[PDB]
Design a protein around this nucleic acid. Sequence first.
DNA 1: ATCTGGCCTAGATCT
DNA 2: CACGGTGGATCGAAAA
DNA 3: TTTTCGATCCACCGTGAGATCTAGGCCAGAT
DNA 4: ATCTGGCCTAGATCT
DNA 5: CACGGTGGATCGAAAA
DNA 6: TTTTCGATCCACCGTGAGATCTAGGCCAGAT
Lengths: 468, 468
Amino acid sequence: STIFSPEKALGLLLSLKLSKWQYITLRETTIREGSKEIYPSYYKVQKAKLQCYPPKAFVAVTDSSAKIALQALLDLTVNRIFETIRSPDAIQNKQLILISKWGFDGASNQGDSSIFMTSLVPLKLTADGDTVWVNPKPCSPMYCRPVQFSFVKETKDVVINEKTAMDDEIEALVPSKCQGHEISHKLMMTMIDGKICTYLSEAKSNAACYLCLLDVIASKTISSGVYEFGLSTLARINVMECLLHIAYRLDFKKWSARGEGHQELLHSRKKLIQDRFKDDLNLLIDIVKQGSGTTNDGNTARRFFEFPDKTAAITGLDEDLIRRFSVILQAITSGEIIDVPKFKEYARTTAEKYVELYDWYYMSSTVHKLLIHGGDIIAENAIVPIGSLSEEASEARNKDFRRFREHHSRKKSRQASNEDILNMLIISSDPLISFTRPKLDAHKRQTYFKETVELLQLQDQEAPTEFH
Amino acid sequence: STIFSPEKALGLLLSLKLSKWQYITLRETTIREGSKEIYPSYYKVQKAKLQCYPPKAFVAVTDSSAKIALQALLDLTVNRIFETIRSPDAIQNKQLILISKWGFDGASNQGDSSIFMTSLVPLKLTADGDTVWVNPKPCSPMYCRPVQFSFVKETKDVVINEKTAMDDEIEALVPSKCQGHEISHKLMMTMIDGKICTYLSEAKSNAACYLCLLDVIASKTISSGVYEFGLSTLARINVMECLLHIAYRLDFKKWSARGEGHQELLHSRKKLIQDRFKDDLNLLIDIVKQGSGTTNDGNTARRFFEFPDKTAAITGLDEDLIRRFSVILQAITSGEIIDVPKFKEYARTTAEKYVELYDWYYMSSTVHKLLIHGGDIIAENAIVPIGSLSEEASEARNKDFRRFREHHSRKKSRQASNEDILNMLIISSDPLISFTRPKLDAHKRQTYFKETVELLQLQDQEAPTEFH
DNA sequence: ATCTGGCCTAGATCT
DNA sequence: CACGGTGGATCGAAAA
DNA sequence: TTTTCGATCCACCGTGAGATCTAGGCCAGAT
DNA sequence: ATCTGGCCTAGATCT
DNA sequence: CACGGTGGATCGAAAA
DNA sequence: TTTTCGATCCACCGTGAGATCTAGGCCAGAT
Ligand SMILES: [K+]
Ligand SMILES: [K+]
Ligand SMILES: [Mg+2]
Ligand SMILES: [Mg+2]
Ligand SMILES: [Zn+2]
Ligand SMILES: [Zn+2]
């Protein structure tokens, strides 16, 4: 009937960041100027705004939180993606999988102390191993689906609780159904900040490995993220700690503390290396930690690997192995896809050269996972393990929330303001809606060392400054 | 050629409060959706945006201020008003007068301490004594033309200086010219806050009157506002002070301080009346003033006349005269047009009854002007002497400035940010452009005493809460 | 065993 | 510190 | 030889996220 | 005439 | 304190 | 008996303007 369907009038209503009064006056002005058939009435705008929303028996909002039963959220997603983005019957019976990735990160608000929001972005819709739907910008806020949030300060406690709830809700849900098609789901946990990577990674450094219980007895459990968390998520901290053991034990060619005369000299070396690091680069190190195991910021681990030569000279760990750790962690943290066989052989040779540089000191668990069993988990998931919003992207999504809380919710009962935040965080995410953020500025790419670009593939949609 | 002329695409661009990127994406999206002939290109948007701007040899912006030579501003105004809002040759030679009113008021910003902006709103365009153009909402920010501003704290000093500059620039300018029509100008100063009314009114209470040098020798000088300022602008303060003299002299039936035994009892009465007022209503009074003549806030004068009965009992001034002062000041402050003969006879009878209530105390100068020569100045100007933005209106105009400073200027050299503020404060004012603010809420009208509504005419465009 | 007394975490302030 | 966002200046292609 | 059209520049000011400094509640020496 | 000492104006905080 | 601004709920007219 | 259309409601949260409280520089009693 009209030029703009409701499904595109909505896209306009979002991209221009328009209020209800603003859209109503826009359409009314276009009408008054003689043209009559361009902008759907708000009635239809909202009648599509409803098909963007899940069944209201599943959206549970309270004055403190808003939770969408993941089942309904995934049903909604796989319904919208079809409803517009596939010419139907392109496949008749081929299996469908909506490969998606989720997570959360608190962000202060400058009461509403700091939002803490689970989040979900549909990455791809694959059929029988073939692509039907691809996300044009997997690090852009275009497709951030909210699963739940609540205005609680992001302690370790609220994080561990929310992760427990969400990781059981994930195990629960059943494949979704749309127009005679039975779509299964695959969710990974990669929307993790650094702080949260510490809060979750610091359960304990456990002395085991599942595959190694050399040969393999193939039995795998990929779910609940524990594999990815322990192996590669923001292992950097552990790595800086792990090697540091050697940086102290550099005297007696062993790990234990049972020796006589080993321990006093070992303590003194810890002393002097900590004094050296404190005087040359002013970075606090493991020397002060009493709770939940030895732990440091991501600040210290990053600034450790931030320059290979300087700290490599400092610690006495010869510069080449620190070069290798810096480059492989640069690969993980980079945000680009990991080429399986090249990264795998780089890691295998790094392992070989490392063990033949230090064989007295056996393989530390976290590093043993990162290097030996490292690449095959990027393989079995085909993921970007750091995959999460860019600096400009997370900045835009947090400004999205602050806008939808301050300008696009209704200042009533408080059940409603959170209800509208949740609404617009679905609408603005709808895989069905065209949505145009202003064009980014071309930034010089993240300066990378001379041995990583072969591990990455720089045909890219990302432009972050300090992380990715 | 296209549905929206540039002159209406601009109206849309403003009313929706749209940025340049937002308008460009709006038009581009409408284009991409198949319709091609609706939204002018930004090139034409801006080519009309130029005809909204005065000749750039007159806009003088510096890192501290922005001043438009009033001549150019009035030329621009009388050009735009014709260019769209008159079917030409409706009159061929009849004289033209753009009756306008101006003023200023500082407003803090919550560096950019507080803007202090001259302002101008074209009220009417009259021809040979007949209306051609009428302002639909003379208290709305729709037509606020900026003459100059500068980010300076609003002392009495900057105000008196800016008023001197503007009142000489007004005397200077020459009738404007548009398409064979020679338009003269008439500007009044009514865009005055209360604070500014004090800062200007407190030159001195001078012992004279021009008409009275009983009969009249007709010689009049209406310009420079001095008449309106001294006579009726926010005289209320003076009135509360003037009568207060009697409220002290209630003992000896005279004005002077030469008596013996008069003065001590007079001081004691001042004491006790000040103690009574301080204990019953907690309002500070004239008793403490050492500089620039006796002066009080508008707070105290208003709260004085805020209830007739209570303070009327307190002061000993019989309640009826205070009823009359309250009602006539309510008329001035009300914001509604003043019916000349009814208001005039009300004031004449108030004068008669007052002098026959207190004749010992001669007519104080400010009150003598307000009541005896009072109405004829509303006559010779046909004005709303309080005419100035409403609460919601001034709130919207100050939010206009904060928006055009924070969102619609360019963050460059600072010559430019002020240049764009000035631009959009002209554009958003253009008498040529349709501009739709969101619809106001119906408020209960300002509660008025039972003898004023005959002085006002409540066929109204105004909806303020505390002032008008 | 008490009396205050040098440290380990949240707000405030850089960058 | 880094980046986003301002609206005009400027330039080249194009329209013609 | 004019207008129109689009992209890019200009360059700084807020903002904001991460990252550093600064104030109050708890296990060792003397009675 | 000096030495500090009770008041009259700007920022901060209600409403 | 007062008012503006939120987007949906609800209702009546209307479309038909 | 459905959809569509418009206006009005819901009612509270920021904001903001005016209006109140709170900290530093100047003319009288003793040397
Ligand atoms: K940032
Ligand atoms: K107000
Ligand atoms: Mg975080
Ligand atoms: Mg003012
Ligand atoms: Zn293993
Ligand atoms: Zn007179």
